[PDB]
Amino acid sequence: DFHFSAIFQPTDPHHHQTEFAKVEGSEKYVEEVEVFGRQALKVNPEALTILAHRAFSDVHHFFRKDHLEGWRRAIEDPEASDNDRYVATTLLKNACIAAGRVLPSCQDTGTAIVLGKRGELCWTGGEDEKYLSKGIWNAYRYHNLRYSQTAALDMFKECNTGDNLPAQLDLLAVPGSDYEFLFIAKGGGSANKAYLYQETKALLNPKSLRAFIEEKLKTLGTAACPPYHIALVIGGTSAEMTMKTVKLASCRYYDSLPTTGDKYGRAFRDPEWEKIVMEVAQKSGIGAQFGGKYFAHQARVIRLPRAGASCPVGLAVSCSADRQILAHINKSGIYIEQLEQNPAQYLPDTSVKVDLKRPIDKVRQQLSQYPVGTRVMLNGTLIVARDIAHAKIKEMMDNGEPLPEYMKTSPIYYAGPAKTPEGYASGSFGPTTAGRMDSYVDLFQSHGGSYITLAKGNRSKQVTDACKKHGGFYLGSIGGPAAILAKDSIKQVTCLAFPELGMEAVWKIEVEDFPAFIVVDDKGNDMYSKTLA
Amino acid sequence: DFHFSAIFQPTDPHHHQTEFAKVEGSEKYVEEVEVFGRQALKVNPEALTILAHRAFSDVHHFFRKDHLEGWRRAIEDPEASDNDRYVATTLLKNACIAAGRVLPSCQDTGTAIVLGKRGELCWTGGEDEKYLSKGIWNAYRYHNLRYSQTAALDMFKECNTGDNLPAQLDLLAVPGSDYEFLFIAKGGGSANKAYLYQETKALLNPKSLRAFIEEKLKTLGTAACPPYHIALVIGGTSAEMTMKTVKLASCRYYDSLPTTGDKYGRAFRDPEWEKIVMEVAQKSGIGAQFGGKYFAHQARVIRLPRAGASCPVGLAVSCSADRQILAHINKSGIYIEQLEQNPAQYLPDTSVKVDLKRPIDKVRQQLSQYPVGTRVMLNGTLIVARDIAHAKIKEMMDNGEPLPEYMKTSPIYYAGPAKTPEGYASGSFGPTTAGRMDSYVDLFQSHGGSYITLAKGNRSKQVTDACKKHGGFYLGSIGGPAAILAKDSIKQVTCLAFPELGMEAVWKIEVEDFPAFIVVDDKGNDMYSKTLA
Ligand code: SF4
Numbered sequence A, B: 001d002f003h004f005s006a007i008f009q010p011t012d013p014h015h016h017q018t019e020f021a022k023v024e025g026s027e028k029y030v031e032e033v034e035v036f037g038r039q040a041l042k043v044n045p046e047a048l049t050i051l052a053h054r055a056f057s058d059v060h061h062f063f064r065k066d067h068l069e070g071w072r073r074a075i076e077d078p079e080a081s082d083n084d085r086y087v088a089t090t091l092l093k094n095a096c097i098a099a100g101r102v103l104p105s106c107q108d109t110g111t112a113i114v115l116g117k118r119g120e121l122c123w124t125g126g127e128d129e130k131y132l133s134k135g136i137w138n139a140y141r142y143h144n145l146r147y148s149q150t151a152a153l154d155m156f157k158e159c160n161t162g163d164n165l166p167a168q169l170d171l172l173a174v175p176g177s178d179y180e181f182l183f184i185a186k187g188g189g190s191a192n193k194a195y196l197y198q199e200t201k202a203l204l205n206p207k208s209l210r211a212f213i214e215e216k217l218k219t220l221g222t223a224a225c226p227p228y229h230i231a232l233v234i235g236g237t238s239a240e241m242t243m244k245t246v247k248l249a250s251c252r253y254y255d256s257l258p259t260t261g262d263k264y265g266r267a268f269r270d271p272e273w274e275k276i277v278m279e280v281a282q283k284s285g286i287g288a289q290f291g292g293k294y295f296a297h298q299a300r301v302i303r304l305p306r307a308g309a310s311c312p313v314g315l316a317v318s319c320s321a322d323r324q325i326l327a328h329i330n331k332s333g334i335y336i337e338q339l340e341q342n343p344a345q346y347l348p349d350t351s352v353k354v355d356l357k358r359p360i361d362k363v364r365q366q367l368s369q370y371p372v373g374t375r376v377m378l379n380g381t382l383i384v385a386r387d388i389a390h391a392k393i394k395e396m397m398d399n400g401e402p403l404p405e406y407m408k409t410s411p412i413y414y415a416g417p418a419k420t421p422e423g424y425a426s427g428s429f430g431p432t433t434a435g436r437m438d439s440y441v442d443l444f445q446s447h448g449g450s451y452i453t454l455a456k457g458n459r460s461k462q463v464t465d466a467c468k469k470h471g472g473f474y475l476g477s478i479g480g481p482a483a484i485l486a487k488d489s490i491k492q493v494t495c496l497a498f499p500e501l502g503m504e505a506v507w508k509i510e511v512e513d514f515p516a517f518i519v520v521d522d523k524g525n526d527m528y529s530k531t532l533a
């Protein structure tokens, strides 16, 4: 016989376990009507603008409960290292600064990703993408966020869009008369740690699957600001269907899934292997960015059906800028997920001063006296440059032009600033993944620059070779707390070169008491070699 | 100050360049009505069953023009190798056998993928997925197709579903009153060659991108039945958005895109780099499965916007079972893409006999006298076993049980048969990707079995090592032509062990004049080591 069985069978398909708050007066944009015997809902498209505006505004200032609980868990656990409690407190204190509705929680305000489920009898006019984008356009223009989207004029010529557009508008056709949503402010670092592996039947056994998890979790590293929300998907009907599942699973969108499969190949969570992923994360010693136990907040494992020959595997994380918001529109109005507004209640209840107001050769001498893992406090001037800045500088040296003088005077800060609020010295200004500028380290160091670099995440072995060769260093900043570094450490920000690039321009900043860890010294040591071998 | 710009702006968004055919009397399933001043369309949900039925039935017997043109181009091109013209003729002859509406073009009838775009005012009742699944359920139940889906009862315990369900129903919400579709019969092998790479700005330059394409195209190998439809996507708003684009790009779904970018980051095809991908494919010498020029039919390259920190890259192919069908439902009725029904017009106007009815050691002696690249014709008995059959045998040997004697008598054929037509000796019965059973070659050969293996695609270096140690061989069949091997070569099919596995049971077949190439000999030679180094 025939029996239809949906792949995803969530016992809470409308997310009732989430607390919502209705926008004041939002019932003027909806009207319940009846057509041909069926109840419909007439939605003013201006409601989609309001919803995307409020969603992509508040999500950069508040977090969910399960995200804040994980930070408190890293502080109150006796088994957490001193670095775990240090990073967890720095992020929680950063979460309190962001709650002021002025600074975003992280400088990477991220890509706007909208998963919309429009009912068959939910009528908006059809221009949902135009109206949702306008709400997103207001969120990033009129608030101290950052334009992070890069348009391609051809295959290689790029420019910023100036409005954090386009967005990923994944609008689906679902039954009913409502309009359910899921807004995601996916950061760049956590989006780059969405890995796709094509596997076989040989993987599907407890011995090989655990070894797979042990092997692949190390590839995440600390380049996406742990503690993570590790998501793992085994199987799938296609590569994109697996990567979409692991993306939503990282947002706890599929938590209501069953925990047992049937003869119809339904999706299900496997809590047994969720605990196994957490055991591998804790035993790894990678910890919260700088060694410890709390490498991950929690794990979600989903087992999907597969073809007899195919077995794709998805692995993705949610960074410390865990930014998702559930929402829906019905006859009552616009309801949007309520996020925790008082993060201070989750807060319970050894450093070395380094001044960069010297010749950089004198700063290099001081850093050489301390081993990897030493906590340092930078006080001086930094030169900020990232992906596009490094790419242009290399093209100058390939045309005979010299290495610019700003690359040699001060340490290099891999960072991209958000917009500065009125009356503030600097907007959110946190570090960026260092590993993306690894191919420029040896080249720039052999030309008398980039001796000291300040960023976030583990770097490749070629960088340690270049540092032990040219006598350089790599300082590892706490990745994540961009708001507290703006209101405390950074005192002055000035543009230096390439103002056409927006965030990715060359900046000169003056910092005070900037926390960082010595990750790579001039002797060939890497503080991540023990845990990320 | 605000301007909305969709990412994908195809100049032919309704696919007018495609030839459609109206189902007779299909206008009885639609009724055009007007509500609140806007014209809507009421669609009987039974129309989705009829549409999915005809789509997933006819697509397994006919191909598009550009796929058949690539085969003819591989025969008449002077620069095509003798093996290119041999494989291209074998596939063309297979398309004519499949055109008989009895045998499917390939034994892997694939996963049913449905991309539906339901209009805002297109009313079907909401149960679109239930009715679409029934149409797919009828296509694979009542036609000589194959149940290829594997349900997971838990994390490791698996069983077949018996109906090639579930499907991937990606139903989107689009403006209007129509219902546009794209049906895909995505095979397992080509779905496993959908690769995701997370890259950086360092890749975005002509020197690095060319080296990237050269390096990554070799990793595809021949395990997905070339000539390919190579699709490459640079950038994207997320990993799943990149992998979805490269799949649709492989189906020529985005051919109508512009060829230039703007300050708004719209998607566009880059024909310049499409020719560069074609130049890399032809100059690679990989050719149509066994060395030559036609490694790919054509290339599609799409440049997507990206975040300043993100740069995902998608690479996927469409195998020789290029199976996609466009369709839509409007006030006129049900329209479905017209595929070429007479493929013979595309066909323009010494082998080594090997007898397998001997001791397998005597067959090994004969094959040892010939080098790699020798084309052989198998005449005897083969033992058919695949992913789950190999997996169960290994767990038996891990419990102390011996390697079953049927693994030692005859060569092992990595294949999974489709359903047998009434009065036919065997349904479509082509080879599967060999590289997925590579971990069993050395183990099984040390127990006196699996000395000769017959499948498709290049294998890992551990297989070449195991052959020079245990004196084994690996014959590479022409991957793709499953229909012509059923009506000509295969004479009898009998189940031998593990009938619980359905398709993936252990089969004993008697073939006659089975074409194959000696890929790995007992001396450490690999005919793919030169092109896939
Ligand atoms: S810098 Fe860290 S917290 Fe911010 S978006 Fe990137 S990975 Fe997430």
Ligand code: SF4
Pocket (backbone or CB within 6 Å): B106, B107, B108, B110, B186, B187, B188, B189, B190, B223, B224, B225, B319, B320, B321, B430, B431, B432, B479, B480
């Ligand atoms: S066997 Fe070859 S042609 Fe058939 S589905 Fe697999 S890759 Fe495609």
